[PDB]
Amino acid sequence: IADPLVVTPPPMNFDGTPAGTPITSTWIGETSVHNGFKCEKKFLQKCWVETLYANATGSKISGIYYYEGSNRYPVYSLPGVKGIGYAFGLKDNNDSVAYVPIDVDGATVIYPAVGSTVNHNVDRVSLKGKVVFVVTDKHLETGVYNIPYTVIANTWSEYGGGHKGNNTSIVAINPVTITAH
């Protein structure tokens, strides 16, 4: 079974602005699920997680990115919203695993990652995500932006051993408001 990962950013206030300006000074809405993907063993058998994949569902905005260190994150448009987009981080919730961009250079391996635990006793991977919103129109209107519930990735598993079937799941952004002055 797999639990959806729904990141929950807090309300934002933005006081202006070139495209690519982040709405907040760092990432927000960090959220994690204990049971990201868990394989269900058949009776008297053993199962483990071999690989997890994430496919970002959004449309990239050409030429706009979110930078952290040597990492360059794509920025996507938000269905229903003009002038604000998002970047996101998604990873194995292992303390040895860093956040790095997916969907760069269709789907992306997210497990194993560098630092992940990998053995036949890993029947469960926990997942963690976060988001940042980015100005994409240099003429962003002032007012109240209501970001709708937005699925941002579909995810799925490849399990090993004797299991009851692979899972699919999602990553989504919970609705949030950005007040632009």
In the chain, domain spans? 1-181
- In order of 42, 46, 61, 75, 171, the CA distances from 65 in angstroms are 45, 43, 8, 5, 20
CA atoms within 13 A on the CB side of 100: 15
b/e burial code for range 38-66 (CB count within 10 A of at least 16 → b) = bbebeeeeebbbbebbbebbbeebeebbb
The dihedral through the CA atoms of 88, 91, 94, 96 has a sign that is negative
d(CA 35, CA 77): 29
Residue 89: how many other CB atoms lie within 10 Å: 21
Instruction: Kindly provide the b/e burial profile for residues 12-23, where b requires at least 16 CB atoms within 10 angstroms of the residue's own CB.
Output: bebeeeebbebb
Strands 124-135 and 28-38: antiparallel
For residue 36, give every residue at least 6 positions away whose Cβ sits within 8 Å of its Cβ, in sequence order, or none.
Answer: 2, 3, 5, 52, 93, 124, 125, 126, 127, 169
Method of determination is: X-ray
In angstroms, the CA 62 to CA 156 distance is 27
Q: How far apart are CA 13 and CA 119, in angstroms?
A: 45
